[PDB]
């Protein structure tokens, strides 16, 4: 090694992504013939929900005491 | 009294023939691919929303008819 600085360093990174997507689709067709009476109908319906969240943090300290460098890694 | 097939559980050829309670005025048949239902029913409830709500979940095809025990599997081609 042939150059130096002597220091303390702290770095805090926080990234949170949340995404929610919900869809409903429904169709119906109904039909009738009367005069005896007859009734029919049919169609398609579907329902979905998806959601996710992802969060992470990295807090790191390089510097001059185990107690306070841990403390600052916990609590800014 | 109206009398329809009114099996308690899905039956590809419901034979359980009953008089319906006065709650009912139509004979339902329903087909949903893998299942078939024949019930004492109401012509007002013979609609996709009522049948899909009254059948506990989701989509189906339905038919209803007036005649005694008229609600039988051949009634629906699905």
The CATH number for B54's domain is 2.10.60.10
d(CA B36, CA B31): 4
Rounded to an integer, what distance in angstroms lies between the CA atom of residue B62 and that of residue B28? 7
Range of the domain at B30: 1-78
Q: Chain A partners of B58 at a C-beta cutoff of 8 Å?
A: 45-47
Number of domains into which chain B is organized: 1
According to DSSP, residue B75 is labeled G
The Cβ-side half-sphere exposure at A41, using a 13 Å CA radius, reads: 20
The sheet with strand B61-65 has its strands ordered as A29-34, A37-42, B61-65, B26-31, B36-41
Which A residues, 23 through 62, put their C-beta within 8 Å of a C-beta on chain B?
28, 30, 36-47
Distance CA A75, CA A23 (A): 41
Q: After which residues is chain A broken (C to N over 2.5 A)?
A: 35
Say if CB B34 and CB B78 are below 8 A apart: no
Q: How was this structure determined?
A: cryo-EM
Rounded to whole angstroms, how far apart are CA atoms B39 and B4? 7
Among A41, A45, A47, most B C-beta atoms within 10 A, so best to mutate, is A41
């Amino acid at each position: 090694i042939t150059s130096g600085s002597m220091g303390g360093i702290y770095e805090y990174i926080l990234v949170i992504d949340k995404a929610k997507m919900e869809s409903l689709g429904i169709t119906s067709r109904d039909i009738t013939t009367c005069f005896h009476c007859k009734k029919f109908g049919g169609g398609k319906t579907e329902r979905a929900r998806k959601a996710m969240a992802v969060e992470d943090i990295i807090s790191r300290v390089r510097g001059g005491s185990s107690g306070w460098s841990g403390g600052l890694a916990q609590n800014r | 009294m109206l009398q329809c097939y009114n099996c308690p559980n899905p039956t590809a050829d419901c034979k359980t023939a009953v008089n319906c309670s006065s709650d009912f005025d139509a004979c339902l048949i329903t087909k949903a691919g893998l299942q078939v239902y024949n019930k004492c029913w109401k012509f007002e409830h013979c609609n996709f929303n009522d049948v899909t709500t009254r059948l506990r979940e989701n989509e189906l095809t339905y038919y209803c008819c007036k005649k005694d025990l008229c609600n039988f599997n051949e009634q629906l081609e699905n």
